[PDB]
Amino acid sequence: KNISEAFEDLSKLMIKAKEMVELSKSIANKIKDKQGDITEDETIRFKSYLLSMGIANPVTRETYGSGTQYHMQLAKQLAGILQVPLEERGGIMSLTEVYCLVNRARGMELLSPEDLVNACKMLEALKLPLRLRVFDSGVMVIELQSHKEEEMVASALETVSEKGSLTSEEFAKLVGMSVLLAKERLLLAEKMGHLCRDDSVEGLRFYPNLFMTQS
Amino acid sequence: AQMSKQLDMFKTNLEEFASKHKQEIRKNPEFRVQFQDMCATIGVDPLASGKGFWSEMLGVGDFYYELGVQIIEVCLALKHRNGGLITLEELHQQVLKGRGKFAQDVSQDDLIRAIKKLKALGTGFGIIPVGGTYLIQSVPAELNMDHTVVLQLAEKNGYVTVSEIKASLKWETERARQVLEHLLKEGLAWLDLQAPGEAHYWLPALFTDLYSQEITA
Amino acid sequence: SFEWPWQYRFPPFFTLQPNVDTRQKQLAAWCSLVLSFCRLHKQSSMTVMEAQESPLFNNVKLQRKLPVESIQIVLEELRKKGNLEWLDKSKSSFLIMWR
Amino acid sequence: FEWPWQYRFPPFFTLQPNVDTRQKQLAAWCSLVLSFCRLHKQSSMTVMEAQESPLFNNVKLQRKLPVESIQIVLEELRKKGNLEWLDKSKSSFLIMW
């Protein structure tokens, strides 16, 4: 009566939502409108419809609504929680370190990966004290307003030079940061031209870019 | 404003379903799979937001999202051992270990579901097909067709050999060498100069240790 | 109580590693293992000859052993960190401390 | 005559992803081959031969310029106008003065 029933009830529950999905792209057809600038409000309700409904995807009605009201709020509520922990790590965290911290504090109603990303993607466009950021590598980071990587490329340089050359795990221990970011810092520095690379089994060493001095 | 009404009707529909079958999406694995499979054919994502109905109502999101954090932790606590690459099997035993021998049962299937969502976070997690199963990757690193292939060869024994590579792949020594060089450079393999016929290259992600996972956490 | 670490069970742990990061990880394990091996069997000193041949560096059955030269590198790391005082201009016998 | 201090610099052996840098790297890599077959007056060699060789292999001192990468430096020298060929798969070549 359970082993069974549960299945029956499911499809019923599903037919129902199936209906929900049909007349929601329909509501997307009922947006022929042409322009787009200062935020609107008819749409606001539509999104919260789709979020509640797991069809959360104006993946084609983007220029018909941004992200979300809930996500805008969540972003704010995030900027509060993340200030401190950002600070104690040099103003930069990995998205997944965040996902880990934020979700580890709450025992329940945890954030979905997308919630977090969505929340963060509009952090910037809310003049908030911290910013999302993506690297060449596709690695996603949260960093403080105050803090700025390109000022950090200057000091990476010295520390490299003081040490001759460093790999990322090496640099990681010296600045005391995460291997993933040390790597990105050294890679950024190589980008801007302060660093050059020595790749081999020994590992991927970064040396100061001498090709630009001595010639 | 149309569906607005029909929506809180659906809440009720779900809420009623919820109280009658919450525990079933815990006691029963094929049940969650069944559930999630159905949502898909429609075009709804029960894991896309903890602020979705299925989530709040069915506790499915907090199931998966907590699972995700747990996948992240064990992969971290073992990165040092296996360079950030781990079999979905080892990964499954450790997740259970962490979850206590007082129930909460999880399946390889769940692990995947969770991993595929952790990709939303950007670069880090990947799933890689080896042999029958998968390798779960948690530190971003390359994964050529060429690297993967050699991963496959190492499945059975936990190690691989320049000879073994050339013999099946028909490569020339150079192609084998760089591949192996990449793996050593990324922490994914370890040179061994005391095996019988030549240098063996062991990948700790294959190779069944597992013995106690302590202190590095 | 005293556990053999996974590494001891792992063949290439017996080969100085070409990757500089892994080598740092290997040697670090190797320092730890010698320290707690000596603690367990209450040994504050021993010669390299015995060291070479004791279970510490010789896994009979994994059929792998830490080659003398390498074992000299670990010894040196242990000295570098404080935990070892050579008793010998010849580096032939050594005292290991937990301080 | 001298080895270029670039030859005593391990990054010199890894093709550099940076656009300003690679240019610098290749200018020196190209001029260095130009001074080499000058001390040991051979003009005719192929891929794998120049490779055992000191100019492209720093043997008793760590690293060796990878495969595709020596091609790159060889191309730069033919479009410079100092190299010719032997076979039409790739391989052998000649350096001028």
The terminus-to-terminus CA distance of chain C in angstroms comes to: 22
- Residues 80-139 (A) with a CB less than 8 A from some CB of B: 94-96, 99-100, 103-104, 108-117, 134-135, 137-139
Query: Three-class SS of residue B194?
Result: coil
Chain A: give the shortest CA distance to residue C17, in Å: 9
Interface of A with C in 160-179 (CB under 8 A): 167, 169-170
A211 contacts D25? CB cut-off 8 A: yes
Residue B17's region, left for phi above 0, alpha for psi from -120 to 50, else beta, is: alpha
C-beta atoms of C18 and B191 within 8 A = yes
Query: Is residue D7 within 8 Å of A211, Cβ to Cβ?
Result: no
* DSSP-assigned states of every residue in A126-155: GT-SEEEEE-TT--EEEEESS--HHHHHHH
A161 interaction partners in chain D (CB closer than 8 Å): none
Q: Which of C38, C42, C78 is nearest to C55 (CA)?
A: C38
Number of CB atoms found within 10 A of residue B78's CB: 24
Q: Token pair 């949260």 is at which residue?
A: A142
A195 conformational bin, left if phi > 0, alpha if psi -120 to 50, beta if neither: beta
Distance CA B65, CA B116 (A): 11
CATH assignment at residue C11: 1.10.10.570
Rg, chain A, Cα only = 24
Is A17 strand, coil or helix?
A: helix
d(CA B177, CA C39) in angstroms, rounded, equals 42
Burial of B77 (0-12, 13-18, 19+ CB in 10 A): middle
- CB burial readout D38-68, b (16+ within 10 A) else e: eeeeeeebebeebeeeebbbbeeeebebbee
Tell which residue, A66, A25, A60, A24, has the closest CA to residue A44: A66
Chain A residues with CB-CB distance to B122 below 8 A? 95-96, 117, 134, 138-140
Please name the residues between 58 and 97 in chain C that touch chain B, using a CB distance below 8 Å: 63-65
Distance from C-alpha of C11 to C-alpha of B170, rounded to nearest angstrom: 27
Phi/psi for C41 (5° steps) reads: -95, 20
One-letter amino acid at C20 equals V
Question: How far is it, in rounded angstroms, from Cα B184 to Cα B161?
Answer: 13
Neighbours of A161 (CB within 10 A): 13
Give the one of C6, C13, C14 whose C-beta lies nearest to B211's C-beta. C6
Q: Closest residue of B to A42, CA-based?
A: B1
Chain C residue with CA closest to A205: the answer is C20
* Cα distance between residue A13 and residue B182, in whole Å: 51
C3 with B202: Cβ contact below 8 A: no
Residue A130 · residue A123 · CB < 8 Å: yes
Residues of chain C contacting A201 with CB distance shorter than 8 Å: 18-19
Sketch out chain B's domains with CATH numbers.
Answer: 1-58 (no CATH), 59-139 (1.10.10.10), 140-217 (1.10.10.10)
Contact C3 B209 (CB under 8 A): no
Coil/strand/helix, residue D34: helix
* CA pair distance C21, A49, nearest whole angstrom: 51
User: What distance in Å separates residue D86's CA from the closest CA in chain A?
Assistant: 32
Closest CA to B36 of B8, B20, B55, B12: B55
Interchain proximity A190–D17, CB inside 8 Å: yes
> How does DSSP assign B125-140, residue by residue?
-EEEEETTEEEEE-S-
Which amino acid is located at A89 in the chain? R
* A115 Cβ neighbours under 8 A, 6+ residues apart: A71, A74, B49, B50, B51
D16 touches chain A (CB under 8 A): yes
Residues in Cβ contact with B164 at an 8 Å cutoff, skipping those fewer than 6 apart: B153
φ, ψ of residue B41 to 5 degrees: the values are -45, -35
Phi first, then psi, for residue B23 (nearest 5°) are: -60, -20
Q: Which helix (H) or strand (E) holds C44?
A: none
Q: Using the beta-carbon criterion (under 8 Å), do B65 and A112 form an inter-chain contact?
A: yes
- Cα B66 to chain centroid distance, Å, stands at 14
How close, in Å, is residue B212 to chain A by CA atoms? 23
What is the C-alpha to C-alpha distance for residues B194 and B198, in angstroms, rounded to an integer? 8
Contact D14 A191 (CB under 8 A): no
8 Å CB contact of A203 and C20: yes
Report the number of distinct structural domains present in chain C: 1
Contact A147, A91 (CB under 8 A): yes
> What's the CA gap between C80 and C11, in Å, rounded?
26
Mapped to the 3 state alphabet, what secondary structure does A166-193 carry? ECHHHHHHHHCCCHHHHHHHHHHHHHHC
Q: Where are the beta strands (DSSP E) in A41-149?
A: 92-94, 130-134, 140-144
The partner residue sitting opposite C15, judged by closest CB among B185, B187, B191, is B191
**D11·A215 Cβ contact <8 A:** no
**Which residue, B198, B201, B162, B164, is CA-closest to B185?**
B201
Tokens 């290749």 belong to residue: D26
E-strand spans in chain D? Answer: 44-45, 83-85, 93-95
> D14 and A200: CB-CB below 8 Å?
yes
User: Residue A200: closest CA among chain C residues belongs to which residue?
Assistant: C19
Q: Evaluate whether chains A and C are touching (3 or more beta carbon pairs less than 8 Å apart).
A: yes
Q: Which helix (DSSP H) or strand (DSSP E) does residue B164 occupy?
A: helix B162-169
Determine the structural domain holding residue D81 and report its residue range.
1-97
User: Among candidates B67, B66, B57, B58, which has minimal Cα distance to B107?
Assistant: B67
The residue type at C4: W
Contact A109 B4 (CB under 8 A): no
Q: Is residue A197 helix, strand or coil?
A: strand
* Whole-number Å distance between alpha carbons of A113 and B76: 18
CA distance A154 to chain B (A): 26
The answer, yes or no, to whether D and C have at least 3 beta-carbon pairs within 8 Å is: no
If one counts every other C-beta atom within 10 angstroms of the C-beta of residue B132, the result is 7
Q: B209: part of which helix (H) or strand (E)? A: none
The partner residues of A195 in beta bridges, in order of sequence, read: A208
Give Rg (Cα) of chain D.
13
Domains assigned to chain A: 1-65 (6.10.140.260), 66-145 (1.10.10.10), 146-215 (1.10.10.10)
Q: Which of C9, C11, C18 is opposite residue B211, by nearest beta carbon? A: C9
Q: Which residues contact B95 (CB under 8 A, 6 or more apart)?
A: B67, B70, B71, B74, B106, B111
Main-chain phi, psi angles of B130, to 5 degrees = -125, 125
Contacts of A121 (CB under 8 A, 6+ apart): A67, A132
Rounded to an integer, what distance in angstroms lies between the CA atom of residue B124 and that of residue B137? Answer: 7
How far is CA A22 from each of CA A5, A28, D76, rounded to the nearest angstrom?
A: 26, 10, 61
CB C21 within 8 A of CB C49: no
Helices B108-118 and B29-42: angle between axes, nearest 10 degrees:
40
Q: Provide the total of helices (H) and of strands (E) in chain B, helices listed first.
A: 10, 6
Which residues does chain A have within 8 Å of residue D21's beta carbon, measured at their own beta carbons?
Answer: 193, 196, 209, 211-212
Q: Please indicate whether, in this complex, the C-beta atoms of B193 and C15 are within 8 angstroms of each other.
A: yes
Check A200 against D16: CB less than 8 A apart.
no
CA C52 to chain centre: 9
Between helix A5-29 and helix A42-52 the angle, nearest 10°, is 160
C24·A201 Cβ contact <8 A: no
CB-CB under 8 Å, B4 with A55:
no
Q: With an 8 Å Cβ cutoff, are C15 and B209 in contact?
A: no
Please list every residue in chain A whose beta carbon sits closer than 8 Å to the beta carbon of residue C24: 169
